[PDB]
Structures are given as structure tokens and as C-alpha cells.
């Protein structure tokens, strides 16, 4: 009546705001149901029942360049040299990269 | 100012649809569409003021709901360019390769591109056999011998 | 009556607050019954009889 | 202001359901739902003011109670992705390996991945036998011989 209507509008806005997820290209998301992992979201539109599901973590899915700091190594000829190295890392679509290591 | 109820709805709907185009994430769409429909319903049918907000909220919920089924029906069995775009593990399925080192105990490594990948097979396979990938587990590739 | 109702609301809030446990992914919790270890909680919703 | 009892409940329920979405842990849900149901009961049925809080508290308790059974029924015999996700000891069950060093006194070490794990078996097993894991105790793996 007098005070119900603004509350109803606000409730509708909040539920739609927190129940609709859009995932960009080059990423995947994870859905936690009260904490437990249940499923993963690919890029697109996704509806998750609110107040029970939330977003776990954001997983990049593109090759990444990763420096390795300077390092001192001894060769087989007993030669002391210093090197630096670079790495490429890619995450296979598994959710493991979020929950199997910190 | 207030004698006309539908004007408020048909203004708010347009304003929210316009606010979309500022760089939104599609959150405001689901309420603007509902506001437009609420205006087109109230203007034709004089619903009670306490019966307006309920219909507007329900219309927002259904506005958000219907396109999910529309889009999801569209995605499956129809679009596959993005499905094969950003998942490598499914890309390697079905490809054929050759082996340079024999598998011991049904496990080893195989050259792909310029790098190597771990492979596992049901039986020990010698060096120089044509193999084809079936499934992927973790990062390990299942391979089986295939005739040329 | 006059003073029971607020106390009842507060009691309900406190019991629900301290009897419902949610465990994040990548962790496990342990439940002690007056001090003794009895069981472990995996990630999800868990009800433990409070106090 | 106070002549309408159901309005208070149907406002508090909505406000708490909204307070959820600020980043809560689900604590406030169980009372907001009860408040909404209390409003929908008082509005239809004029219960006594001293008979409102009791029903609201009992409704909070049952609101928290029912979903536990719903979710727990859902989890068992239906969902196993998270069950096999973050427990390694159960992952190793059923896998097959080979031995490089003979077991002495029914105990030894076995190579898995790039590391080693302690293993125990009922009888002494020589080097080069196919073995399969059965159970796990502490970090020790029970193994038994399996034919190829």
C-alpha cells in the first residue's frame, strides 16, 4: 500500500542485480552454493538463484608471460654463471586452478 | 502531474533503456522493459495504484527470465564458433600424431607443436606408431593406435 | 507479553546466528562437543546444536 | 502507523532479504523469510500481538531447518564433482602402478607422479609387479597385486 510499493521496487531491483551474471570472453567463473562448488560459467548470460549461490573466483584462460627472477647456477664444468628466464602459462578449463593450490 | 499514471511508467522505461547505452552491463534493461509494458497496460486499463508496483516487479522478473531461455535455446545445436574458440583441450581431440619414444608402463610424453604433453594408453606402444587422441583428464591425453 | 517479545526475537536471532555454519571451498572445519572432537565439516551448509 | 500489523512484518522481511545481497553469509535470510510469512499470516488472520513474536521465531527456526534437509537430500547420490575435487586420498583409490624395489617385511615406497608415497601390503612382493591401491590410512597406501 503506502510503504509496500517502494520496498517492492527496491527488492525487484536488488534481486535482478544480484541474480544475473555476464561472463566476458577469455574468462570462466565458478558458482558456490553456500560455499560448495557446484558448476562453472562460460562467457554469456547466466541465471543463478540468489541468496544461495555466489561467485567463487575469476579464472583467466589466455596464455600469460611470467618472469622468473635472476638466478645463479653452476655448470657441469664448475662454472658460475647468472641467468634469467621467462615462462608461458595456460590454464586448462579445469576449476582445479582455483581450489587445488593457493 | 499525477492524474496521468501511465506517463510516469512510459517515461521511466524510456529513461532506463537510454541509461543502458551509457556502458551498462544489462542490469537496467530488465526493469526498463517492465516499466514500458506497465505503462502500456495502465494506460489501457486503469489498475489500482497498489496494483501497479506488483505488476511492474513481476514484469521485471519475467523480462529477465524469458531471454535466458531464448538465448540458451539459440546457443545449443546452433552456434559453435565460440565453443571451439577458447578451449584447447577439446581442440586436440581427434588429432593424429606419431611417437618417438616407446611408452613404458602405459605412460609417457608426446611432442605437440614445439612442446610436449603427457600421454597415457591402455597398452604399451612402441616407437613409431600412429596414435589418435580420445579424451583429456587434467592435462593428460588418452591416446590409442589408429591405422593409416 | 510486554517484555517477552523482544527477548524472543533476540533469542531466535542468536540461536540461528550461532547454530548455522557455512564452510568455504578449500577448507575443512572440526566440531567440538564440550571440548571433545566428534566430527568434521566439509564445504557446504551445516547445522550444529548450539551451546 | 500501528493500526496495521502486517505492514511491519512485510517491510522487515523485504529489508532483511535485501540486506542479504550486501555480502552476507546467509544468517539474515532465515529471519527475513519468517517475517514475510508472518506478515502474510497476520494480514489474513488477526493474531494476537503476544501471539506474533512466538510464531515469527518458530518460523525462523523452521526456515533454517527445512533447507538443510532439502540440500542434504540433493547432495547425496546426485552430486559428485566437488566430492572428488578436493580430496586426493580418495582420488588415488583404484589406480594401477608398478614396483621398482621389492617390499621387505610388507612395507616400502612407491613412485607416484614425480614423488614417492609409503605403501604396505599383506605379503612381500618382488620388483616389477602390477599393483592396485585399495584403501588409505594416514598417508600410507594399501596395495595388492592385480593381473594385467
Tab-separated table of C-alpha atoms in Angstrom, chain A residues 4-86:
chain	number	residue	atom	x	y	z
A	4	UNK	CA	4.957	-1.633	0.336
A	5	UNK	CA	5.399	-0.280	-3.192
A	6	UNK	CA	8.863	1.363	-2.860
A	7	UNK	CA	10.102	-1.683	-0.952
A	8	UNK	CA	8.821	-3.969	-3.711
A	9	UNK	CA	10.548	-1.904	-6.398
A	10	UNK	CA	13.813	-1.943	-4.438
A	11	UNK	CA	13.541	-5.696	-3.844
A	12	UNK	CA	12.988	-6.351	-7.545
A	13	UNK	CA	15.978	-4.179	-8.444
A	14	UNK	CA	18.217	-5.967	-5.932
A	15	UNK	CA	17.188	-9.491	-6.935
A	16	UNK	CA	17.716	-8.781	-10.635
A	17	UNK	CA	21.020	-7.071	-9.881
A	18	UNK	CA	22.398	-9.972	-7.861
A	19	UNK	CA	20.941	-12.900	-9.794
A	20	UNK	CA	22.078	-12.132	-13.348
A	21	UNK	CA	25.700	-12.785	-14.318
A	22	UNK	CA	27.501	-11.949	-17.565
A	23	UNK	CA	30.907	-13.514	-18.238
A	24	UNK	CA	33.359	-11.808	-20.626
A	25	UNK	CA	35.216	-13.689	-23.315
A	26	UNK	CA	38.545	-15.058	-22.166
A	27	UNK	CA	37.392	-15.955	-18.656
A	28	UNK	CA	35.424	-18.506	-16.698
A	29	UNK	CA	33.608	-18.117	-13.388
A	30	UNK	CA	32.652	-20.537	-10.621
A	31	UNK	CA	29.443	-20.748	-8.596
A	32	UNK	CA	29.433	-21.644	-4.897
A	33	UNK	CA	26.223	-22.867	-3.232
A	34	UNK	CA	26.555	-21.786	0.411
A	35	UNK	CA	30.290	-22.411	-0.089
A	36	UNK	CA	30.316	-25.679	-2.041
A	37	UNK	CA	31.485	-25.667	-5.648
A	38	UNK	CA	28.662	-26.723	-7.958
A	39	UNK	CA	29.235	-25.522	-11.536
A	40	UNK	CA	31.194	-23.177	-13.785
A	41	UNK	CA	30.001	-20.331	-16.002
A	42	UNK	CA	31.274	-19.833	-19.548
A	43	UNK	CA	31.072	-16.473	-21.367
A	44	UNK	CA	27.441	-15.496	-21.837
A	45	UNK	CA	24.282	-14.887	-19.810
A	46	UNK	CA	23.735	-16.929	-16.652
A	47	UNK	CA	20.960	-17.040	-14.052
A	48	UNK	CA	21.862	-18.212	-10.549
A	49	UNK	CA	19.244	-18.396	-7.786
A	50	UNK	CA	20.318	-15.578	-5.455
A	51	UNK	CA	20.930	-15.655	-1.676
A	52	UNK	CA	22.206	-19.215	-2.120
A	53	UNK	CA	24.751	-19.010	-4.985
A	54	UNK	CA	27.677	-16.595	-5.212
A	55	UNK	CA	30.757	-16.146	-7.397
A	56	UNK	CA	33.832	-18.055	-6.295
A	57	UNK	CA	36.744	-16.738	-8.362
A	58	UNK	CA	37.656	-15.299	-11.754
A	59	UNK	CA	39.789	-17.576	-13.949
A	60	UNK	CA	41.795	-16.221	-16.872
A	61	UNK	CA	42.068	-18.556	-19.846
A	62	UNK	CA	44.727	-16.954	-22.058
A	63	UNK	CA	48.463	-17.574	-22.350
A	64	UNK	CA	50.429	-15.450	-19.912
A	65	UNK	CA	54.053	-14.336	-19.751
A	66	UNK	CA	55.620	-14.878	-16.330
A	67	UNK	CA	59.101	-13.650	-15.454
A	68	UNK	CA	61.393	-15.681	-13.209
A	69	UNK	CA	63.836	-13.561	-11.170
A	70	UNK	CA	67.583	-13.658	-11.668
A	71	UNK	CA	69.357	-16.842	-10.709
A	72	UNK	CA	72.891	-18.148	-10.185
A	73	UNK	CA	73.782	-21.607	-11.466
A	74	UNK	CA	76.903	-23.783	-11.550
A	75	UNK	CA	77.600	-25.715	-14.734
A	76	UNK	CA	78.981	-29.217	-15.166
A	77	UNK	CA	82.416	-27.654	-15.744
A	78	UNK	CA	82.091	-25.871	-12.387
A	79	UNK	CA	81.369	-22.504	-13.995
A	80	UNK	CA	79.462	-19.842	-12.057
A	81	UNK	CA	77.001	-18.033	-14.329
A	82	UNK	CA	73.885	-15.914	-13.851
A	83	UNK	CA	70.721	-16.390	-15.898
A	84	UNK	CA	67.183	-15.081	-16.195
A	85	UNK	CA	64.207	-16.991	-17.544
A	86	UNK	CA	60.674	-16.453	-18.795
